[PDB]
Swiss-Prot record, chain A:
<protein>
    <recommendedName>
        <fullName>Protein SDA1</fullName>
    </recommendedName>
</protein>
<feature type="modified residue" description="Phosphoserine">
    <location>
        <position position="42"/>
    </location>
</feature>
<comment type="subunit">
    <text>Associated with the 60S pre-ribosomal particles. Interacts with NAP1.</text>
</comment>
<comment type="similarity">
    <text>Belongs to the SDA1 family.</text>
</comment>
<comment type="function">
    <text>Required for 60S pre-ribosomal subunits export to the cytoplasm. May also be required for 60S ribosomal subunit maturation and accumulation. Involved in G1 events and passage through start, and possibly actin cytoskeleton organization.</text>
</comment>
From Swiss-Prot, chain B:
<dbReference type="InterPro" id="IPR023674">
    <property type="entry name" value="Ribosomal_uL1-like"/>
</dbReference>
<comment type="similarity">
    <text>Belongs to the universal ribosomal protein uL1 family.</text>
</comment>
<keyword id="KW-0689">Ribosomal protein</keyword>
<dbReference type="GO" id="GO:0022625">
    <property type="term" value="C:cytosolic large ribosomal subunit"/>
</dbReference>
<feature type="modified residue" description="Phosphoserine">
    <location>
        <position position="79"/>
    </location>
</feature>
<dbReference type="GO" id="GO:0003723">
    <property type="term" value="F:RNA binding"/>
</dbReference>
<dbReference type="GO" id="GO:0002181">
    <property type="term" value="P:cytoplasmic translation"/>
</dbReference>
<feature type="modified residue" description="N6-methyllysine; by RKM5">
    <location>
        <position position="47"/>
    </location>
</feature>
<feature type="modified residue" description="N-acetylserine">
    <location>
        <position position="2"/>
    </location>
</feature>
Length: 105, 217
RNA sequence: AAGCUCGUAUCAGUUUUAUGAGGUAAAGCGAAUGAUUAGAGGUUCCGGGGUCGAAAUGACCUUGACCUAUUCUCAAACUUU
RNA sequence: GUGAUUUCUGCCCAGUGCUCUGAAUGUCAAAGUGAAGAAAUUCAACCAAGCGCGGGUAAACGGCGGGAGUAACUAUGACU
RNA sequence: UUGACAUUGUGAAGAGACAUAGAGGGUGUAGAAUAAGUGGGAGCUUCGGCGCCAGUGAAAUACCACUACCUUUAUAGUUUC
RNA sequence: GAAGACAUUGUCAGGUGGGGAGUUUGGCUGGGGCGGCACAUCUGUUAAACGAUAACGCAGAUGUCCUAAGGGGGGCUCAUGGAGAACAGAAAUCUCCAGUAGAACAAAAGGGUAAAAGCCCCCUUGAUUUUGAUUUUCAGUGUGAAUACAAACCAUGAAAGU
């Protein structure tokens, strides 16, 4: 009906929708940003402040990617790490900072 | 000679410089027809969701010889019998597999794509594949084949900040070529995503094929 | 207060002749406003949410919008005419 | 500022100030320097200081049934 | 409180980035290759080289351009070190 | 015994500061008495979530509608209600009767008018230009709108006309 005729004809629509089925359907097939967010296909769209977005070993992947790449962001990361989950976040932040005033701070 | 009759640091209106006119009639000495290099500045991004996938009208032809590949099955081949350049059935898809390749832009549909996928490894060169870009996978072709014979502006997926396609030549008629360039901007400006940056106009650059270019704002 | 130009020369708190102009009376909500009222009985793979079968279109409820079957027909001061 | 002795903060530094040997090229006049120009006006970039960020400081002014973790990317703050 | 010139001389001054132009590398899978996001594919001296030469295949190799420049030199000189 | 071509004075964007001077107080809860100043365009967004909530800002349209719903000739004579029928129920298609307008007649609305001033089909470019005058407001104004002739250039119709 709604989603009926939806997939019928069948991306912001996709957005609301979720907001893999037809999902991963058109999937393989920055609003996109937010979406992939809430959402692996998300991983993909990702890899495609957007860093803040992406904020999974492949996450670590695109990570060291733009890492050596670029080689604000720092501040944001630190704030997020300061705001299981906790442990992971902390570790990641430390690794990034090591790869430093505010550091020891 | 040809440089002193052109401007590089001075902007002009469409009624001053070229922009599909005839100001390069005495400039271009060669009798061979040239192409319109209408360049445009439009800052975009690297997002696949941000792009124009339409088709410009362009009423007046560009005066050129071309040939398309008409091939349909089921019953659509009967409707496309009068307006066609070649038959090309289902069993005639193995003819171009040899050495003969006198087919430029072949047109098909979405129904006959199970066998068309075998022709893709040979016809992957020129940008004319069947996807979601250029309008092709569709059962309708009666009121579409009569349009492609009027020389349609084939829009492609460009990404560098330089934006230029193909208008015409500029040697047919004065006032006739004026109402042609009015669709090369109207369609482009129509498809404007909110995710884009700054403006979409920028600077307008128009040239020929040998002579210097200009600048329009 | 101080001047100029004229003469059968300016008319009317009372009586007869009804040609124009107007937006107070009437009406409507069936394309404009508002106090466009008040209920019951059904149908659930897949309109959107639970419990119970490792499962397969195996089965069974509740909580919001409709259809069928009724009632009123919308205050004179909202507007125009 | 407090105003004899005993008594004399339990915790917190996100906002309003001060200090700043922390952090300096996002923004930053004139002079000097750089195009066009027989001229005038306009004039892109560089730099100092201030502003932004952060920490300390509330016996100097507040807050004081407090401080966290929780399917929203920031917006409710139940339960524990 | 801060800065340039002048007041105020002299150039034996350690180490950088520029104001006009010509080479040097553009090396991720596969293709023996330098196919750098995008555009341009009938073309410039025409006797002659490449015009689309083979296998592979999302992009195929002269051609006036928005270009991120790893590392040097550069004529009369250079505001603050 | 300090030190140095150091430091201090004067005209040089702007920034720290009511020590001091000048200037600044219509009316607005029967005096006055918190802070802000988010009044009027369908929905989403604009807009920090069950209440409200503006903005000549952004993305179609939009300071309502029209690229024949204009003018003209011919033909036809509407809705609702009652009474019927092969597919077919109180609603759909066809036919008949009654019937002085609650209609139709460019925006929202209300009288008009019936061999229609309207609707449909067919036939179309006078909804465009030059030269005068008049009505309401006015100082026989600006702007805008309406009515009525002559002199060029068109369309419709059998004729008479607009």
């Amino acid at each position: 009906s709604t989603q009926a005729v939806c997939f019928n004809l069948l991306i912001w629509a996709t957005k609301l929708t979720r907001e893999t089925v037809e999902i991963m359907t058109q999937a393989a097939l920055k609003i996109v940003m937010s979406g992939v967010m809430f959402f692996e296909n998300s991983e993909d769209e990702d890899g495609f402040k957007m860093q803040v977005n992406k904020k999974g070993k492949k996450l670590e992947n695109a990570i060291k990617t733009v890492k050596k790449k670029k080689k604000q962001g720092f501040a944001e990361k630190l704030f997020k790490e300061h705001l299981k989950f906790d442990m992971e976040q902390k570790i990641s932040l430390m690794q990034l900072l090591s790869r430093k005033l505010i550091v020891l701070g | 000679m040809s440089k002193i009759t052109s401007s590089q640091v001075r902007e002009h209106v469409k009624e001053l410089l070229k922009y599909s006119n005839e100001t390069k009639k005495r400039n271009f000495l060669e009798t061979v027809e040239l192409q319109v290099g209408l360049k445009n500045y439009d800052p975009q991004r690297d997002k696949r969701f941000s792009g124009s996938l339409k088709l410009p009208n362009c009423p007046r032809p560009n005066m050129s010889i071309c040939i398309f590949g008409d091939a349909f099955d089921v019953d659509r081949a009967k409707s496309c019998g009068v307006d066609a350049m070649s038959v090309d059935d289902l069993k005639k898809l193995n003819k171009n597999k040899k050495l003969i390749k006198k087919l430029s832009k072949k047109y098909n549909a979405f129904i006959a794509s199970e066998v068309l996928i075998k022709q893709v490894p040979r016809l992957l060169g020129p940008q004319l594949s069947k996807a979601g870009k250029f309008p092709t996978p569709v059962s309708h072709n009666d009121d579409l084949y009569g349009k492609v014979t009027d020389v349609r502006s084939t829009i492609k997926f460009q990404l560098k900040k330089v934006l230029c396609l193909a208008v015409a030549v500029g040697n047919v008629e004065m006032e006739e070529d004026v109402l042609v360039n009015q669709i090369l901007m109207s369609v482009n400006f129509f498809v404007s995503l909110l995710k884009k940056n700054w403006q979409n106009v920028g600077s307008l650059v128009v040239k020929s094929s040998m002579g210097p270019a200009f600048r329009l704002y």
